[PDB]
Design a protein around this ligand. Structure first.
Ligand SMILES: C[As](C)(=O)[O-]
Length: 406
């Protein structure tokens, strides 16, 4: 028995023999006529989005894209960006998302490092990529009519689903490889607690280069909710966003605390508020943890798929990172990879089926940061990711972070 290893709830049913394409295809075939995406006054249904992304995927297959390949993604916020992401997904390949403000040289170095077979962009933005050697396709040319149907090879759970390169890093590139298994499990695990529903209308304001975009997009895809895609102009105007959320009857908001703290008024019809990025300050909890709001705080590194722990915020309750997500787990070690007794301070480590494959093409660093778990109780717990954060375990079984080890 041990009180120095904290586990999320035990839900083995969240580990299915599935890939992202299966989740989306299920939703699209089950709710073909429900609105999936909204961009300004433009709407697209799940069935329409599915068929268009399928045509794009068949075009990708004709150009040589196959399961396991990596395809870049660089488009403006809107419907075409999400459709291109889905097109890459349905072809069986993994996508490399680039923020809208990524410089071309950074795109080049990231595509080279990932050995990407190509990337998708727009006709307008195509001109800005003279220095990129890799093949570049436009969303327009991938949407032309096909003369005959192309069969798409299926990807498998062990294959990559996407690779995250830290947007805004000028240092040597470090690609984090997330597998289909990682992300499918994460989606089911976190939604078992958040509870995004088909009736929800979800704000989509994060760039696809950031983890929380998944919580906006794919959680929605999981249950068939509708996405309202914010334009670039809106993302920098908190008052205007606060009003837009009311006018459009948005019910789910994923955001970071600093953005929420800049809202002048309450947005009463927000069912769910998921705050990632940083721990929520007490004043903001007192301001927004109202009876008609379910206010959450998610913590977790990119290397363990989007999020690793989740806390329900409530007025008067001190803020913590909460407990691990279902089937996730956390423990604490010292400088020499030894399990610490409850109460002692050390490096926080995370395990579970959502621990990433590692860093792309950097096996030394991967082996230094992804280590064997001598205390695993199942095959899904055999890999610890070392967060680099100091932490200790409360006398109440709660993890408390204490800054960085450096
Ligand atoms: C190429 As290396 C030392 O980051 O595994």
């Amino acid at each position: 028995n041990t009180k120095n290893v904290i586990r999320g709830k035990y839900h083995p049913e969240f580990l299915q023999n599935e890939v992202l394409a299966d989740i989306f295809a299920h939703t699209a075939q089950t709710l073909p006529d429900k609105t999936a995406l909204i961009e300004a006054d433009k709407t697209l249904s799940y069935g329409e989005l599915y068929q268009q992304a399928l045509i794009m995927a068949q075009h990708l297959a004709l150009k040589g894209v196959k399961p396991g390949h990596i395809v870049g993604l660089w488009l403006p916020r809107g419907i075409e960006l999400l459709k291109a992401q889905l097109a890459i997904c349905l072809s069986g390949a993994a996508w490399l998302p680039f923020d809208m403000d990524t410089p071309a040289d950074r795109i080049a170095v990231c595509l080279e490092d990932a050995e990407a077979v190509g990337m998708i962009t727009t006709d307008e933005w195509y001109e800005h990529l003279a220095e990129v050697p890799q093949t570049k396709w436009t969303n327009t040319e991938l949407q032309k009519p096909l003369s005959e149907s192309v069969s798409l090879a299926k990807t498998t759970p062990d294959q990559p689903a996407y690779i995250i390169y830290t947007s805004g890093s000028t240092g040597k590139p470090k690609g984090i490889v997330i597998t289909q298994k990682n992300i499918c499990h994460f989606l089911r695990s976190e939604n078992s607690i958040l509870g995004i529903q088909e009736q929800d209308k979800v704000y989509q304001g994060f760039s696809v280069a950031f983890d929380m975009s998944f919580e906006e997009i794919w959680l929605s895809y999981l249950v068939g909710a509708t996405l309202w895609i914010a334009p670039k102009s809106l993302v920098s105007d908190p008052e205007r966003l606060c009003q837009t959320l009311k006018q459009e009857q948005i019910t789910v908001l994923h955001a970071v605390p600093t953005l929420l703290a800049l809202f002048p008024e309450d947005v009463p019809n927000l069912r769910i508020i998921n705050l990632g990025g940083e721990m929520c300050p007490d004043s903001l909890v007192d301001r927004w943890a109202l009876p008609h709001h379910q206010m959450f705080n998610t913590y977790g590194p990119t290397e363990t798929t989007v999020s690793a722990s989740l806390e329900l915020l409530e007025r008067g309750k001190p803020v913590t990172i909460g407990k691990p997500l279902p089937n996730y787990g956390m423990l604490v070690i010292n400088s020499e990879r030894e399990l610490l007794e409850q109460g002692e301070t050390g490096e926080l480590c995370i395990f579970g089926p959502s621990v990433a494959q590692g860093y792309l093409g950097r096996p030394d660093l991967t082996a230094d940061k992804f280590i064997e778990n001598p205390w695993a109780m199942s095959v899904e717990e055999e890999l610890l990711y070392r967060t680099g954060d100091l932490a200790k375990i409360d006398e109440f079984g709660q993890v408390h972070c204490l800054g960085r080890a450096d």
